[PDB]
Every structure is written in C-alpha cells, then in structure tokens.
Amino acid sequence: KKNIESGVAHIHSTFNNTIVMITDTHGNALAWSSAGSLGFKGSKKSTPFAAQMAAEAATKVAMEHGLKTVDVTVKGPGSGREAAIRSLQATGLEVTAIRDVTPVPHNGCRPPKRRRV
Amino acid sequence: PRKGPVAKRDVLPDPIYNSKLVTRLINRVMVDGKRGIAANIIYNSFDIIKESTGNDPLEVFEQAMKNVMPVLEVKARRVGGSNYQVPVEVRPERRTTLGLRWVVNYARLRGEHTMEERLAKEIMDAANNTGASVKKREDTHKMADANRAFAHYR
RNA sequence: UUGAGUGCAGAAGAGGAGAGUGGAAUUCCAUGUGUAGCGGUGAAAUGCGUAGAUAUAUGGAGGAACACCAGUGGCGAAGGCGGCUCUCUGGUCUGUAACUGACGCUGAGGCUCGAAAGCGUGGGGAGCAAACAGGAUUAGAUACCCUGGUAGUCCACGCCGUAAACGAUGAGUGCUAAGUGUUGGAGGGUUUCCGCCCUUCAGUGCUGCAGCAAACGCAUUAAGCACUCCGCCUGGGGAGUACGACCGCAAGGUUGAAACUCAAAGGAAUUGACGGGGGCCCGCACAAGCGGUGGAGCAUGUGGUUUAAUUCGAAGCAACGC
C-alpha cells in the first residue's frame, strides 16, 4: 500500500491491443490493465474505446494505494495513446510529463518479409 | 438531397391557440388523415390539463418540452473505415421534432383503458421530470460522451 | 612543338587493403516490482503463460548493420563503395612551360578483375529465412495468410565466372544556336566579399533551333556532319539443343549446326471495347422520415408430384393479378 502517491503510467500499444500500467518512479508496478482483460475479443482492442475503460480500471486500483501525480510514457505508436491520456485525466490525476519514447534502431537487424496480400 | 438544401415548410397556426407548435403536435398524432379526431382529443387533453392541477394550459406543454428536449446525440462520422461516432450538437428544429417524437411516439405504451389518459396525463407527467421520456434523454446523454475523448477532435 | 608525357605549385573525394574503436536497437541471462492473460487475422486457429508469462527499472553475454548529415551529391574501367581513429597505396582536375620531341589510337589470340546464388576446408549464429512441420482459406491449394524452423546470409583461404552485368547507346579525335540549375577550380570589377557581378576550365542535370528518325524521340554528356580500329547481324520455330573440342571436384561454362515444319513472327502509332485502374457528376441511389413485405388467415400466379389429359408461351433487372 504505503501511499507512494507520485508515479508514472506507461501506455504500450500495438495495432491489435494495448496495455496500460501505472507504476512508481522506479517504476515498480502497482496495477496494469489490458484490453483483452476487460472482456473484449478480436479486433476491437485497437479502438480507443478500450483505452478509456482500461485507464479507469487501472486508476481505481492505483489510487486505492494512494496516488496524486502521474507522468505519461508512450510506446508502440497507434490509436491507443491518443485517448488514453485524456481519459487518464478524467478520474482525477495530475498529468505533468508526457513523453513518447519509441524503440528505434539505427538499422541493426532485419525486418521480416512483406505481406503479399 | 444531393445537390443542395431543401425548403422546410413553415406551417399554419391553430384555430384556437394560434400556435404552430400545437399544430405540429396535432400533426404528429394524426393517422390516415383523420385530423379532426386527433385535434378534438388534443383539445380534450387540454381540458384534462385545465382541471387536474390547472396551472397554465400551455406552460405544462412547454415544461413537457423542458424535461425531454435533447442537446446531444452521437453521429457516425467515420473517415477512413472506422467506427468513431461523434457526439454532435443537434439542429434546433430536429431537436423539437425529437422532443415531439419522444412525447407522443412513446405514449403508445401507457396501456390504460381510457383512451386519452395515455395522452393528457402523460404530457402532464412530462412537465415535472416524470414520464419515461425524460430518462430516455438521460440514457441518451449517458451513451453520449462514451467516446468523448476520441471523437470530439473531428 | 600544336598531339602525346615528367616538371614545380596546388585542390577535391562513401578509391582500395590492413589494424583498432563508438553508441543506439533486437535476442538471451540474472535481479526487483507485479497477476490472468499475451500473440496473431478479413475472420479465426496453431503457439507461449500459475514450473509466474507479457510489462517496467538495474546490470551481464554475443552477433550483425551504421538513425539525421544525404543532395539528379561524390569516387572509381565496370561489378560496386556511407559510423569513427591510424600505416601502405592507386587514380582525376587547375595553373605553368624552362625540359623530351610524334614517343599516338585501336587492338584478333593471351592475361587480370568481375553482384547474388553455389562448391570444399575451419570458425560463429543477433535477427532474417529456401527445404520442412503445424493451423487456417478452398470443390481441391503439395501457394498467397499465421506460428515455428535447418542449410544460407558473416570471416579467412581456394574454386566457378553467370545477371534485366542496361544509358539494352564500343572506343579515339575534330566541327556545329541558346536558356537554366549544381559539384570542383583559375582570372578580373568591386569589397567587413563570406556574400555579389563578368570571363574561363573539367564533370553533372533540365528545357529546347538546325539536323536525323517508321514513330516514340535524340539534340556540345547527339541517336547530327564526318575519318581510324575492333565486335556482331541476314524470317519465326527447331535450339544456344546434337556431335567434336577445351575448362571445372560438382552444378555447369565457352565454341556451335542440320533433318523437318510454318506464312508468318516483329516494332511504333490510330479508333473501339474491356479492367478486380483513377478523377468528376447526376437520379427515393444512399443518408432523414412515413408506411409496408417476410409472422397469421384467405384470394391469385409459377416450380415440383399427378393422371388418360393436368393444352402453349414467358425465366436477373427487362418471367411469376404476365
């Protein structure tokens, strides 16, 4: 519990799912939330409709342990991070640092084949 | 339709109240062109208005308009093959038409034996936050803003 | 001495080989935090996860490739060459002229270099991925789709010597209107020139006279006017096959016909038609409403079964109260 009350949330998104986890300043974990974990199936996990309620189910368990301020970290650029932040503001947080760090190479390894569709 | 906007057909006022709104109220009751029966049962509804808690025969209709009339509605404005419906402000005439629809076209369901107790007392109920058409607007606003974040940017 | 070469003075440059080094990113391992999913598709499934996954912070291991700079920019005879530091070393341009004095060009045979894939011997595997396994799609799918996965891709030393190795344009030199960018110089006017303006050398694009071309097009980087030298062609198949010869461990490479068939095969352009190519318009075509059909009962019209006969036509819109 311990009422750490100042942490960083992490928004990780694909083209078919997203995951939000609110962590500490380490960031040691408090609570995660996943679009498949909230009952969705199939392709619907791409839309930001799951992002709002995933952010809500994260922040409830988060500020049961005491939470005031939060920072934003964005990975995997798609549709999820557009509405995850403004839904994350809605249940009472203090968003004050927004960054989009993407794991970007400098041409290290090879990407796979194209899709002949 | 395709080319440009169409005309909108302003109407004639009443033979008694000199109202276009009550005229339009009659015309969204009328079935098969029987206008006189619907008009006379609406004057009977005003007579039921005037007796039981007679306050004003028209302010009760305006408060029935108060507790029903929307301000928000979602509209499926996708762009590139999506499903991002946007809660959009409604046109004011369509707003009043949805109000008349939610008053009269829901009043089929009271099911009481006297044939205009589903009309007169029904619009009496809508004046003071009763009648299920108010909660229709409530759940309409609650299913609105379900995509408040990822649709209001368009 | 005008062509052709060494002077001395400079200049640019992913030219080559050898030796070291830098960070990011992926994968693996360790540690902490943290629970029910992660991953994938048009849709699903195979798959991994309570033997604690995914995710998030800390380190540790190893391989491969060099984010912005980057530009119709540069270098080289071509194939090709982009992180950084150093040793050896090739080539091009500009000035100038004391010095050699026609020493040149092309070049059958011969030699050298020569993308990927492939072969032998010895190392290493981070990704990626022929062959292969499984799931899915389909009438069927020994494919496209998803999950895995070896040889290979890397280095050293040898071999083969092919490509749509292309500007599909052999090499050397001379001559023939302009305009416009840009890489590297030299000179002059002017000048805190670092800008700017004029003159001139080597590349390098773009547009356009004459001229050429069947057309498309080309056009001082000619496919124009010419000379010198080399290579190749003579209807389409048969076929770069057969024999002979040479090279190679092997796949194969180089040189290279006839018997017999056909009356065509081929280039460029014009008009239609079509596309599962594109841009614009218009209609109760969508969207907004109102009333319906498909549910029930009956009338009526077709298909099917029938009898001896159920007489004929009409079959998507555009047949079925015809």
Chain A to chain B, count of Cβ pairs less than 8 Å apart? 19
Q: Which residues pair with B72 in a beta bridge?
A: B89
Tokens 């108010």 — which residue? B134
Residues A17/A36, Cβ–Cβ less than 8 Å: yes
CB contact under 8 A, B149 and A52: yes
**Closest nt to residue A108, judged CA to C1':** C65
Helix (H, G, I), strand (E, B) or coil at B73: strand
Calculate ∠ Cα A109-A113-A114, nearest 5°.
125
Question: What structural domains and CATH numbers belong to chain B?
Answer: 20-143 (1.10.455.10)
The sign of the CA dihedral A82, A86, A91, A96 is: positive
**Closest nt to residue B94, judged CA to C1':** C288
Residues B58/B48, Cβ–Cβ less than 8 Å: no
What is the Cα–Cα distance from A16 to A79, expressed in whole angstroms?
A: 10
Amino acid, single-letter form, for residue B77: R
- For strands A5-13 and A18-23, give the pairing: antiparallel
The residues, any chain, with a CB within 8 Å of residue A29's CB and separated by 6 or more, are A21, A23
Taking the mean position of all CA atoms in its chain, how far away is CA A99? 12
The alpha carbon of residue B84 is apart from the nearest alpha carbon of chain A, in Å, by 9
Tokens 């079935």 — which residue? B31
The sign of the CA dihedral A64, A68, A74, A79 is: positive
Calculate ∠ Cα A98-A99-A100, nearest 5°.
135
Amino acid, single-letter form, for residue B10: D
The residues, any chain, with a CB within 8 Å of residue B60's CB and separated by 6 or more, are B49, B123, B124, B127
B79 at the A interface (CB within 8 A)? Answer: no
Is the previous residue joined to A92 through a cis bond, with omega within 30 degrees of 0?
no
What is the Cα–Cα distance from B124 to B137, expressed in whole angstroms?
A: 17
What is the Cα–Cα distance from B25 to B10, expressed in whole angstroms?
A: 14
Span between the terminal Cα atoms of chain B, in Å: 23
- Burial class of B89 by CB neighbour count within 10 A (0 to 12, 13 to 18, 19+): exposed
Minimum-distance CB partner of A87 among B82, B83, B149: B149
The sign of the CA dihedral B68, B69, B72, B75 is: positive
Of residues A45, A31, A56, the one with CA closest to residue A80: A45
- Burial class of B79 by CB neighbour count within 10 A (0 to 12, 13 to 18, 19+): exposed
Element (H, E) at B103: helix B92-104
Provide the chain B residues 10-39 that lie in CB contact (below 8 A) with chain A.
Answer: none
Tokens 């308009």 — which residue? B65
Q: Find chain A residues with C-beta within 8 A of B147's C-beta.
A: 48-49
Backbone angles phi, psi at B20, to 5 degrees: -80, -30
- For strands A67-75 and A94-100, give the pairing: parallel
Solved with: cryo-EM
Q: Quick one: three-class SS letters along chain A?
A: CCCCEEEEEEEEECCCCEEEEEECCCCCEEEEEECCCCCCCCCHHHCCHHHHHHHHHHHHHHHHCCEEEEEEEEECCCCHHHHHHHHHCCCCCEEEEEEECCCCCCCCCCCCCCCCC
Of residues B124, B132, B121, B137, the one with CA closest to residue B63: B124
Question: For this experimental structure, what is the resolution in angstroms?
Answer: 3.5
The residues, any chain, with a CB within 8 Å of residue B127's CB and separated by 6 or more, are B59, B60, B61, B63, B64, B66, B67
CB contact under 8 A, A83 and B146: no
Element (H, E) at B74: strand B72-75
